[PDB]
Each structure stands twice: as structure tokens, then as C-alpha cells.
């Protein structure tokens, strides 16, 4: 589970575009500051290489 | 679980805010897709189990 990849993205990337931002995805209305749930997750989703 | 109740859906408009209502609800992985694309996606003979 070492190996990661992102499940969630703001706005679709450029060619050759690169990002490392790891922020709670924001899609409820009400900010979700450093809280996972309805709408919100962190952009970061695990291989699990099995 | 051991009767378990399915049940088919069809023409259906499915909006996923009123499960997000729920404060109980804590399961909304999707094995699937990604819960933003869910409400993009459209599907048909959609079944659902209970
Ligand atoms: C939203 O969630 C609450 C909490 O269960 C519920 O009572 C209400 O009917 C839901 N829908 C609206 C439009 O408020
Ligand atoms: C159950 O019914 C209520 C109506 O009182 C409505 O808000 C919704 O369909 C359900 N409530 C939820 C999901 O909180």
C-alpha cells in the first residue's frame, strides 16, 4: 500500500503537468477543513498492490 | 444477509444528496467509480440489494 494514486482532481491537467497537493477534496459547499466525508476526501488513493 | 432482498431499478433521476442528509450514513466508498463521476454517470438495469 506504499504506491498511491490520486482518485480525485480539481481541474483536469495540462500536458506534462504535474501536482502534489494533498488537500481534502472541497466539493460540499460548506469547506471541508480538514475533514473527510460527504464530498470531501483527500485526493490521495492507495495501489494496494496485492 | 441471509435473505437478502434485491430489487431493480429503472428510469430512474438519482440525486445522492437527500443519503448525503443522513448523519448515520458512513459508507460511501463505491467500489465502482468515483462518487463525483456517480452523478455524472448514467447507467441502466441499475439492481440494488438491501
Ligand atoms: C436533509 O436531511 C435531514 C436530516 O435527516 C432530513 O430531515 C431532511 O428531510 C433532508 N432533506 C431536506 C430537503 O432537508
Ligand atoms: C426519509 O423521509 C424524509 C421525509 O420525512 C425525507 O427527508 C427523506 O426521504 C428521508 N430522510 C432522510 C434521508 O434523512
Do not use: M
Not at chain 1, 480539481?10 to 469547506?31: C, H, M, V
Not at chain 2, 450514513?25 to 454517470?41: E, Q
Request: net charge positive; glycine share 4%; proline share 5%.
Amino acid at each position: 500500500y506504499n504506491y498511491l494514486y490520486r482518485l480525485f482532481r480539481k481541474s483536469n491537467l495540462k500536458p506534462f503537468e504535474r501536482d502534489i497537493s494533498t488537500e481534502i477534496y472541497q466539493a460540499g459547499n460548506k469547506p471541508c477543513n480538514g475533514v473527510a466525508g460527504f464530498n470531501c476526501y483527500f485526493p490521495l488513493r492507495s495501489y494496494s498492490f496485492r | 444477509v441471509y435473505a437478502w432482498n434485491r430489487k431493480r431499478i429503472s428510469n430512474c433521476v438519482a440525486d445522492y444528496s437527500v443519503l448525503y442528509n443522513l448523519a448515520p450514513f458512513f459508507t460511501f466508498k463505491c467500489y465502482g467509480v468515483s462518487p463525483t463521476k456517480l452523478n455524472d454517470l448514467c447507467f441502466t438495469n441499475v439492481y440494488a440489494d438491501s
